[PDB]
Amino acid sequence: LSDLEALRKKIEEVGMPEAVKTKALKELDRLERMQQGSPEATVARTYLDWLTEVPWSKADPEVLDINHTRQVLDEDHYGLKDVKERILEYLAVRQLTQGLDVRNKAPILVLVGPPGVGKTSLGRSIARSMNRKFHRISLGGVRDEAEIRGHRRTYIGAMPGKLIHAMKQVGVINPVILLDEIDKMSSDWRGDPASAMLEVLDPEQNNTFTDHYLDVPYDLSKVFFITTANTLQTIPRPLLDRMEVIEIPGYTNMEKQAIARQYLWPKQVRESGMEGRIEVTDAAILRVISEYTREAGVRGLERELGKIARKGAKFWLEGAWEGLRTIDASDIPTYLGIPRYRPDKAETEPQVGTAQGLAWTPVGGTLLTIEVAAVPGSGKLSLTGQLGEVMKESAQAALTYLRAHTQDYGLPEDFYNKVDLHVHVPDGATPKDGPSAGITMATAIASALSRRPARMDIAMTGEVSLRGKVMPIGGVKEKLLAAHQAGIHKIVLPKDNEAQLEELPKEVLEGLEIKLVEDVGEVLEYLLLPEP
Amino acid sequence: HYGLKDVKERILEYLAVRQLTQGLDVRNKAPILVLVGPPGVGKTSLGRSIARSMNRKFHRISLGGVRDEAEIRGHRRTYIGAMPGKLIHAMKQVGVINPVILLDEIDKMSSDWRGDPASAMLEVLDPEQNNTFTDHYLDVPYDLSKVFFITTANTLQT
Amino acid sequence: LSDLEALRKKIEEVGMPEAVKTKALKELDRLERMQQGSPEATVARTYLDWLTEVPWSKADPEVLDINHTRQVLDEDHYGLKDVKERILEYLAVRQLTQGLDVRNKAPILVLVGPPGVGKTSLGRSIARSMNRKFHRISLGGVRDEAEIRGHRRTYIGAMPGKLIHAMKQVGVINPVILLDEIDKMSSDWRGDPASAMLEVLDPEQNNTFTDHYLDVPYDLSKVFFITTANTLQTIPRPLLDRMEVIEIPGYTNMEKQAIARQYLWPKQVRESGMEGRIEVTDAAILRVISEYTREAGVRGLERELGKIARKGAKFWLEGAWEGLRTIDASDIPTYLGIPRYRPDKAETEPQVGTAQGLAWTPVGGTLLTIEVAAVPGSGKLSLTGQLGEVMKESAQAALTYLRAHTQDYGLPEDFYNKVDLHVHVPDGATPKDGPSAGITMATAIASALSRRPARMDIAMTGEVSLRGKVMPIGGVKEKLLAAHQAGIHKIVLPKDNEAQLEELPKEVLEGLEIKLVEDVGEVLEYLLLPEP
Amino acid sequence: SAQAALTYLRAHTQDYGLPEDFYNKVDLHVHVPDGATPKDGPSAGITMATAIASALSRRPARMDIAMTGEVSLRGKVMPIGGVKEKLLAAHQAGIHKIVLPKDNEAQLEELPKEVLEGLEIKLVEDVGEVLEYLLLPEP
């Protein structure tokens, strides 16, 4: 059987380490046995082909310039001007730390941001920069550590981990690996794979990476890693060492629009073959953004411009009746359908009992409508929508301020003995956990008991305390990008956050009219439509 | 059946993209048409009718109840009893280099294996790594570059 | 199968004792079949590999030179010169640590203190001195004995508790192993996790460690265990048998400054491979200490000097124009951006219903403002924070004292008919037995029902006896350190802690002003803007 | 969704003939016949609101008019999605009248006439409006 000869010459083919060479030759001289029963040459054959084809001693040339990378990051979406700098910082430290202190250093760049924004693109830009190759590996639903480690060389039909498939696809030893969705692993079967990730991840324990299919542990000691995420709260503590957060925030609609013209819509029109035939005036791109997507980034716009490209190709195919096909913001619906969303959220028309909190889920910021019903009763405080007592303390504290400040806001002097509250909070357990929306509930309860309408398109965030001082929250950037994606102009913030606002890059600020306050009394001054 | 008024619009749109092809326009980013429905609303008639309207030879090869990379792939080509997968067996049953192949109920997959064969699906179903497609019983790449697909299901959740 | 030809060696190539050969027979009964989907035999041979590769008969070079240990610990974190004397006299007394031996005590050498100090690295330096090996794992995130005892070895997925795994990850059979956060567990599954630690507890009870997974017991006798906890409020009582407590308190600002000069900076510079091309002045270092980090460890200084190193790396990469940039305290916002905390706490401006106490948290005693809402009502009391009820009865004592001292401060004689109270403590859920905010809450409620302002920057603590006397508490050192560093000067301590005043160096005692008081009327004359 | 329906109703005990308190006295037992719908969440809010009001007033619900939607704590009937699905289900089972949110006239236009040509859709905005349809026998 010349398959033995093929296995032998594939050992003769590829370079390999010393113990790998000895184990491969002595396992090569186990052959000439049962093909068909307990298959004593086939599983060894597949085992030897795994031990020959996997790349040893083969390398990509690498770049050692940062300015090249600064150009290539100013060609992706818009540059973003802000978090290309962090990637420069880590890559800069990687340039200097090559003089033999590479080990046990160097976090692995968790890149946190809502799904679809330029993360995989960022890996593309970096791998373009360095003359590396590229791969992706998705880690949603991995529970077996032997999906990460090898799995036992027992019978034919046994296969190694994710990571050695991926290191087998490339032909060199030094790729880039975008570990997709590292915060979504499970462990209900044997083995908790977070420990295997700490085996993979650390630059001293990568080098002895545990392999159950292979004998010899592989060397991840040259694989540049990079790693996605969506939420820091599902990220554990042992992974949280050797990770510098790179905070990818949401986009702004002017950044979205120039992202369309410079980078989205020519790629779509190059897709469906209409090259140089249809054009879109930019008011129509604004019609598309402001009315046919509510997300963070470049998924909604990719779908909408795809459907425009296809419908245009069909309409062209039954006659070529124009010179160019221009499109205004009026005949987008011909290509796409009914009005889904409102133009701005100024079409929102003040309610009686409902407040509008800025909030940030870790997969895209949003509004919340906290809804309050003052029903006749005894004085309970029911908080549905999956809440702990941090929200209950916030509600009790805002009600305590009202118990201090009845007459200032047109209320009965005794109501806490007689009026039950039911409170619906649509998912108020989201990160930035606990209250970052205390003033929201203050205006909500003031609205519901005051019987006076709470305005809309004035949407805020922050904490309160018992005397009624509005305390500063952290992370004003994410909350303002929520207010800026969801089509809101007017924001109210604590006065103690006016040190944060001056670090905000001017795209984010200059659409918005910030009404800085310092009391609960001041948001009940602005936000209510009559003053009670 | 009666026209359906709405799906054959979208099918003409997808085919209108397949018009603007056939050069070395490398736009192989191509969605592969997950048809979705209840039990029995006229899917395989759409498959047959498209294959007739394009003069191609329709051939179902269903993939319901799968958890193995051996329905798709070969075996130990060392003893009598080694056989290729459902695809090259289908391309033996049908005999054209450019068929239409209605894969069937692809949301009935399962998992009693280390590795869902959804990745083994993902080798053939891409327009790129179809072009090197080889089973264990095979040696040389049989391409599927000319082989138009279509795929039903019953729920997009699973 | 073919693996039995190797596994017949694997039991008699590993040095195994007689009961180990007995458990080898116990597994060998279940061996010697076909492995065609055999879930019991799979975990049988897996447990067999656990039996083989875990080592035997390997003692260590374990040196016993006291001034050697002292000289290794002369480089430790800063010295601290007392608690290293405690450990040096541990190893100077202990010829009993399985050397010259009796059955008298085997203490466990517990540590409780700041989360960020080098008590872990003290354990590292200990293992360097003992010349044994090291491991660590968190006992935080433990609620179960499935992590200590293995699973029920009767089907596939029975895996050992990770103590056996960690002893597999030591090639010899008497190392020193660390446990971390021993005191953060819950009685949830498989009974008490502390019951498993009671089986581990005594040095001959762990010699017979049986499991749901092991059958014939494993040796745990020679391996020195030591813990590392950080809660300063409770101690678990079933471990009080055979225990030696070694505490570590916080620091002074200038000691942290010295630590930044000594050890932290050259490591942060060598993480970015700089050759010391960047100097920071101690003026600027103390500015970093004041304005940025509020901790009693070296975590914050570690990361922020990491930031300065990395920013300096990226600036130096864009051109070589330097021999040194001695960075001063003004262009630190060139690198670190905005500084968060203030050197100035003269901006405090006495509020109506507040106080500012010194609590005893599991990072040490710190500052916490306690907020009070006196509302009209029905004489009630509510706490928030889900406190230790020493806060509740301290509120009881404070209220009864003010009911005995109504007219002398100007209070209305009735308030338990008309006024409810809501009391927020930020973190008084500690098991600090006794309030460390008794007179704090007393001051606050007197200020609140007074409707008179309450001066800040006067950090007070202790308890209230029911006879109007200020009861003493311990742990005075860390709280005086916290009030020193946070920008507070006036202290209100009991008289009956006067020998604890001896227990601190005069740098703590020459930035402050400690008032021995014992009548509560004295301090309530001291704080309010009216003299009563 | 059940408690939201009760919240609306507790605000509106005058209008429907309920006794002036009823939260103190009546335990509520709910049977939802379905095993596991891949549609999760309340696509049947005013379904439960009508069931609850008809039960607590002991007055029969007309089992002739199909309905769907979501609810909210004052009666603001939110819109729902998948209207082609629910209308095809409402006409395969031989029902001819469907109650929908008033936020679904813009959704009630893109459908083929093949589907809209049996039904008589009667759009409403508030929970009081579905209780004007389905509560004929007030005595």
Residue numbers in the entry:
A (entry chain B), C (entry chain A): 243 to 774
B (entry chain C): 319 to 476
D (entry chain C): 636 to 774
Direct quotes from the study:
Lon is involved in cellular protein homeostasis by degrading damaged or misfolded abnormal proteins, which prevents these unwanted protein species from forming toxic aggregates. We show here, using cryo-electron microscopy (cryo-EM), that the activation process of the Lon AAA+ protease may involve a pentameric assembly and a substrate-dependent incorporation of the sixth protomer to form the substrate-pore-loop contacts seen in the translocating state.
To provide a comparative context, we also examined wild-type MtaLon in two states: without any nucleotide (MtaLon-Apo) and incubated with 5 mM ADP (MtaLon:ADP). In the proposed pathway, the THT is formed by sequential incorporation of the protomers, beginning with Ob1 and progressing in the clockwise direction through Ob5, and completed by the incorporation of Ac6*, whose binding mode is dependent on the substrate.
